[PDB]
Design a protein around this nucleic acid. Sequence first.
DNA 1: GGCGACCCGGCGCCGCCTACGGTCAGTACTACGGGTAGGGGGTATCGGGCAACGCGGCACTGAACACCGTTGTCATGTGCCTTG
Length: 105
Amino acid sequence: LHTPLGEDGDSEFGDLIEDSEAVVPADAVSFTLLQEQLHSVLDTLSEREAGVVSMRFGLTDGQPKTLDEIGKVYGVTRERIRQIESKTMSKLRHPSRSQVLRDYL
DNA sequence: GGCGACCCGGCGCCGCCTACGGTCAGTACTACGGGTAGGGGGTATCGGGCAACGCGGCACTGAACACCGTTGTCATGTGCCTTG
């Protein structure tokens, strides 16, 4: 990386290649706005529906939880949880609570 | 003998940002040996689709009583007629 870069002075091949680990502020703030808007639309729905979808898709922890995995803290059945998840997906699929999330993809 | 030159070392610098830049370098070899990460099959455990079994309003078997309403009922009282 300390090669002359073909230039006798003031240059180094080590100062011409961009990295990839660096966080792009644009993408980061877009993600933050996505998180806030999704949390807002999530609060718009019922608090119970909100909580169950959040725990299923893991919106507070990195790893999502399985259906029956939610039926221990909340004390519900593996098929009840599936049913409320299904009707949550049905409601969120409504064009009402989709537009604000369309551009986010 | 400390000065003195001189001699050398030795470093250290030589100004600020800007556009593009083109490429390639020669003389071992086999042989074994272990040991694996990858190729396979079969098994134990967790994760989905239909009914599940609650509830609640009210609603009915109306049943069985209750609330007035009513013409049943009547032993017991006025008015006229006959006899004291």
